[PDB]
Amino acid sequence: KVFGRCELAAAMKRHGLDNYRGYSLGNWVCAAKFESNFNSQATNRNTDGSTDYGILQINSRWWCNDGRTPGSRNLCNIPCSALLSSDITATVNCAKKIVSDGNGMNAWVAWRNRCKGTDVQAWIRGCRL
């Protein structure tokens, strides 16, 4: 499913991401924009052999099981394919474990390089929330 900017903002809000760990809603929407272009079906393989999945490009090396990442840890206790659904629930739950983990949203390279320290509020501008 390719989400709309405001549609995604609303679902993430409903799922408790706003201000989660102190990150405002626009941070989450900005990251989704640059990680996957708002496409829940996005996949990208990495050089280490792991793969990133979904709107927030959660990595198979730590977070989910894809059956082809040797040494994967599966910290979110879920099949990576679950992160590709039109229902963002699994994505959101797993992302909450990631961001609590220590380096905050820096976990997401595109957030760090493209969102951090920018006016992220522009991302939820005009939405009915």
Side-chain angles (χ1 to χ4, degrees), residues 27-87:
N27 281 283
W28 295 106
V29 171
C30 181
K33 170 78 192 180
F34 298 121
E35 284 294 353
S36 69
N37 206 28
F38 302 143
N39 188 358
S40 71
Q41 297 193 76
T43 61
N44 291 294
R45 183 99 50 113
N46 320 110
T47 56
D48 64 3
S50 63
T51 304
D52 298 338
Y53 296 82
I55 56 152
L56 295 169
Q57 295 282 276
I58 291 170
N59 190 257
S60 71
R61 164 125 353 264
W62 315 89
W63 306 115
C64 59
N65 177 45
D66 66 1
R68 63 157 191 203
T69 316
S72 179
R73 281 174 142 188
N74 202 12
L75 289 178
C76 300
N77 192 211
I78 34 142
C80 302
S81 62
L83 305 172
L84 307 182
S85 182
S86 298
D87 184 334

Side-chain angles (χ1 to χ4, degrees), residues 12-13 15-21 23-26 28:
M12 289 175 149
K13 187 171 165 185
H15 276 89
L17 273 182
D18 189 16
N19 291 301
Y20 189 88
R21 293 304 183 118
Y23 293 89
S24 77
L25 197 60
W28 295 106

